[PDB]
Design a protein around this nucleic acid. Structure first.
Lengths: 123, 50, 60
RNA sequence: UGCUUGGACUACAUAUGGUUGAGGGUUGUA
RNA sequence: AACUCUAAGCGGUGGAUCACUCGGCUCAUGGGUCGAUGAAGAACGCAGCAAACUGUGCGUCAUCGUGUGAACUGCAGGACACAUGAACAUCGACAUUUUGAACGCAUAUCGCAGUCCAUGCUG
RNA sequence: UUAUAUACAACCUCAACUCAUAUGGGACUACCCCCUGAAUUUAAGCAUAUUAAUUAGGGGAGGAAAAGAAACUAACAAGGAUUUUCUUAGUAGCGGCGAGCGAAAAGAAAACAGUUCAGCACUAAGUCACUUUGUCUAUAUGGCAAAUGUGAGAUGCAGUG
RNA sequence: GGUACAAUGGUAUGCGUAGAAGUGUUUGGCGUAAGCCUGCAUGGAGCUGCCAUUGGUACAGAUCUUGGUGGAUAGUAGCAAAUAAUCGAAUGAGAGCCUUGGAGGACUGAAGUGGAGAAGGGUUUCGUGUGAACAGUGGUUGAUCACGAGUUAGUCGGUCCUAAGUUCAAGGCGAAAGCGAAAAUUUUCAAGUAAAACAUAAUUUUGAACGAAAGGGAAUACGGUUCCAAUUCCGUAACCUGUUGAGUAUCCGUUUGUUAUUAAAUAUGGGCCUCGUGCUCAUCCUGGCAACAGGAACGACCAUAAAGAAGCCGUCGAGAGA
RNA sequence: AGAGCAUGACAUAUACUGUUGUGUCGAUAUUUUCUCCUCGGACCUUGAAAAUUUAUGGUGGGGACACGCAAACUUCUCAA
C-alpha cells in the first residue's frame, strides 16, 4: 500500500474519513484473529502498521473538528474552556496587562509635564 | 480467599503476569546486562502483603 | 469464546457480536481470568450453528 | 411508552448581578 | 608414597592490588515555569515476539507539525510508504484510562442514584 | 393600608436556586513571611541563665520575599526611606554580674525612586460595573460608540489634593 | 633528622606495546633502620627522580567495620515423636521412597489422617515436558523448573437493611493542624401532592452517610457432562422480580327457541296498564347459628394492629435421615 | 418418558449401538442426629434494631346503570 499520510488525509471529507476508519478497524480485527490462530506468514506485521494507521485518521478527524469549533467560537465571548489558552494557572489570573499597566488620571497628568530630560555634563 | 474484591483480583493478576522470566533474546541484544529476572517471587517464599 | 475488554458488560458483548458477525445470541456468560482478562462464552441460537460462524471468523 | 448503549450534568465556600421570596423590621398613598 | 614439619613449583579457593569510569560530590553562572482548563502522586493497562527499567493511555514503548535526510537491529517481517520522506531529535496540533485537592452519594463495593440528550429493540 | 379584614407600594435585614458569570482548596522545599516552641547541652551538681527568642508542629507567598520614603538620628560646622557588606565590636549594655551573652548611631561601600489615601468653600455624581446594538481585528477576563437598558453610588463614586 | 602514600606547581630535550602500574619470586644487592634499586616470571597503558607547597598521608589490637577463610569435622553433632511395610513387575542412565500399577501385611478408626467451608494465601490447581538448583537420604516424581491451559449464575454469595459504632454537616471552639469534638450542628434546616379557596393550603428539624461474605433479607432442583469448572455448562422440570397483553365476580322478570309454564339465563321487584315493550325501582360477590369458608369481588392517603422479631436450660408427641 | 439412576442377563470388534429383566413387602428403636409441635423452669439476669410486608378501620373521593353492552393498577387464570 501507501503509508496513509495525514497530508493526504486532510483533503478528504467527513464521510471518507470515518469510512476509512472502519475498514482499517476491520483489518486490525482480522489481524487480531490471525495473531493467535497461527498466522501463516512469519508475521502479518500489519498489526502495528494499521494500529498507527488508525491513530492518524483519528488525529486528522479530531483536529478537523476542533479547528471547526474554533471557527464558531470566534466572535463570541465565553468560548469553551478547551478553546481557551491554557498557559499556566498563575498567568491566566494575574491581571491581563491591558489593566495591569493602566493608570490613574493623577499619574497621566504627572506624566505629561516634566519628561526626563536628556542631557550631558562636563565643561 | 475465594471471596475477593475486584481490586485485589487485579493486583493479584498483575503480580501473576510479572512472574515470567526474561526472554532469551533479551540477552542477545548488544551490550546487554540483564541475566536473570531479579523480581521473581515464589508464592511460598516471599509473600505479597495485599 | 472471546477475550473481551475488561469493562464490557454482557450487553456490550451481545451487541458487539451482532454488529461484527451478523448473528444472534442465546446467552452470554462472563468470566474474569486470573491474569485479569474478561472472557465471554457467547452461546449462539439454534439457527446460527457455530461451525459456519467459526470458519467465517477465521478460526477453524 | 419499553429495556439497553453513549454523552452532558448534579460537591462545597464565596463575589457580583439576575430571579423568586420571607419578615405585626422601619414606613407610605389610599 | 602413614601422619607431621619447612620451603618452592603446579593446581585450587578467594577476590585484594593496580589500571579504568556515560557516577557521585563541591564551587560558580544564566534563567523563573504546578494545580478545579484536574497538579504532584497512585493504580491498572499498552509492544510481532517483553518480565523489569524507560515511554505512554483504548489514537496506549507512541503522537500532528517542524528539523535533519537513510535507517531500525536480539530475531523476523516488511521499507515499491527519500523519488513527495526512515530513524532520530524537536514539539507549538490533537489527545491523555481509573484515580488523586477530587467535585452526584459511597468505596476493604468497580456498589446505588437522579436530571437530561440521543440512538438500539414496541407502536 | 395593617378590627392583622381587599390590595398597594417602597425600603431595610435575611433567604433560596443543577440561575448568569466568575473566584478558592492541593504540590514542592533551598531561599521568604506569619505563627507555636522544646529538651539533650553547658554552668564541672542544679532550679534563673544557657542551648534558643533554635530542632520538631502549624499556616502563607514569590522569582525573590520581607522592608521601605521618618512619630529616625544626633547634640553637630549637624545629618535624612528601605535592604546588603565592611567597621563600630565581642563594644555600650545584660547576667546565679556566674556560665555566658551582646546591639545600634555616626563613618566607608553596593544600589538608588519615589509616592498614594481618609479627612476641607470639589463647588451641578463632574464616577463605576453589567447587558444589548453598532463596530474594531487577539483566536481580545480586549477597542470604541450606541440603548445611557439594568444595577452599584448621596451610609459618598470620580477629578483636585 | 630520615623514610613510606597521594596530589598541585615547576623541573628532568625523563621512561614506556622493543611491555607502564600491579603481583609473584632461593636473581643479585644497598641501607643501623624505616625502606630502596635490580634480574626473571606473569601483566597489558600508563608512570617515575628532583625543588617547592601540601593532604581524607603510614595499622596488629578498638568483644573495631565489611568481606573471605581455617580447625573443630566428612565426624561419638547429628538426620530416633506420630506402630509398617514386604514381594514381584514395568520404566529408567541409575529405584526402598515421593514414580506407577498388582498382590499383600498394617495404621488413622470416624471428636478421622475422611469429606467440605470461613479467615488467610495467590495460581500453589490441571495436562504435557523436565536439566541444574530446591524437596536437610535418594528421586525417573513434585506445592520445584519450562510450556500450555483452567474459575461461566435473575435463583449460591456480594450488592440491599441496620446493630455496636464511625465519618463528615456550622452551634461552636482552637494560632492553626485540627478537635485521640461528636458535632446533633443549622434563616423556610425535613415530607406531601388524579395538588386548591379573604395564606395556594393540611404535616413534620436527631441533619447525612457508612458499618454484618455468621444478624435481617425476593426466587432451583434433579439427572448428565470435564485433563481442568459447576445449585453457574447440558438436558429436564420449576420459581422470583419488573413491564406489557389476553382471558375471566353484573350474560334479567321481558319475551327470541317458546301461548304463560320458559329458555338463552350471579338476575328483579313495584304498582297500574290492552298485557306490557307502558311506567317505575334495583347489582362495589356469596355461604355458614357460629368458629369461619370460596377463584376473583374499591393499595389513592391518614390511623391502628400484626408479621419481620430472636436468648439459655429442659420437655410429651410427630416426621426425616440414619 | 417400565424415566432417570443403580444392581444385574445376554447381544454387538474401534467396525461410531441396540436389548430382556429387577427395583418388593413388613416391623424396630434412634435420650445420641436434624426439624416440627407441645408444656415447663432459672433470674435484684427478662433475653436486638431497620428496610420489607400484610390485614383492618376511617372521612372524602372514585366506579356501577339492563331489556344489556360491559368491565376490571383487576389480591383469579394464563401468555409475551
Amino acid at each position: 500500500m501507501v503509508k496513509v499520510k495525514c497530508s493526504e488525509l486532510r483533503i478528504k471529507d467527513k464521510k471518507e474519513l470515518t469510512k476509512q476508519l472502519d475498514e482499517l478497524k476491520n483489518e486490525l480485527l482480522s489481524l487480531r484473529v490471525a495473531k493467535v490462530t497461527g498466522g501463516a506468514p512469519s508475521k502479518l506485521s500489519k498489526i502495528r502498521v494499521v494500529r498507527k494507521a488508525i491513530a492518524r485518521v483519528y488525529i486528522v478527524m479530531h483536529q478537523k473538528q476542533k479547528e471547526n469549533l474554533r471557527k464558531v467560537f470566534k466572535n463570541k465571548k465565553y468560548k469553551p474552556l478547551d478553546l481557551r489558552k491554557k498557559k499556566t494557572r498563575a498567568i491566566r489570573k494575574a491581571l491581563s496587562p491591558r489593566d495591569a499597566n493602566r493608570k490613574t488620571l493623577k499619574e497621566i497628568r504627572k506624566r505629561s509635564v516634566f519628561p526626563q530630560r536628556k542631557f550631558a555634563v562636563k565643561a | 480467599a475465594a471471596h475477593k474484591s475486584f481490586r485485589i483480583k487485579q493486583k493479584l493478576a498483575k503480580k501473576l503476569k510479572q512472574n515470567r522470566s526474561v526472554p532469551q533474546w533479551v540477552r542477545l541484544r548488544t551490550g546487554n546486562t540483564i541475566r536473570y529476572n531479579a523480581k521473581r517471587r515464589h508464592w511460598r517464599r516471599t509473600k505479597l502483603k495485599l | 469464546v472471546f477475550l473481551t475488554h475488561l469493562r464490557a458488560n454482557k450487553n456490550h458483548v451481545r451487541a458487539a457480536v451482532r454488529k461484527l458477525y451478523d448473528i444472534k445470541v442465546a446467552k452470554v456468560n462472563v468470566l474474569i481470568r486470573p491474569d485479569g482478562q474478561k472472557k465471554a462464552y457467547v452461546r449462539l441460537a439454534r439457527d446460527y450453528d457455530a461451525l459456519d460462524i467459526a470458519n467465517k471468523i477465521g478460526i477453524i
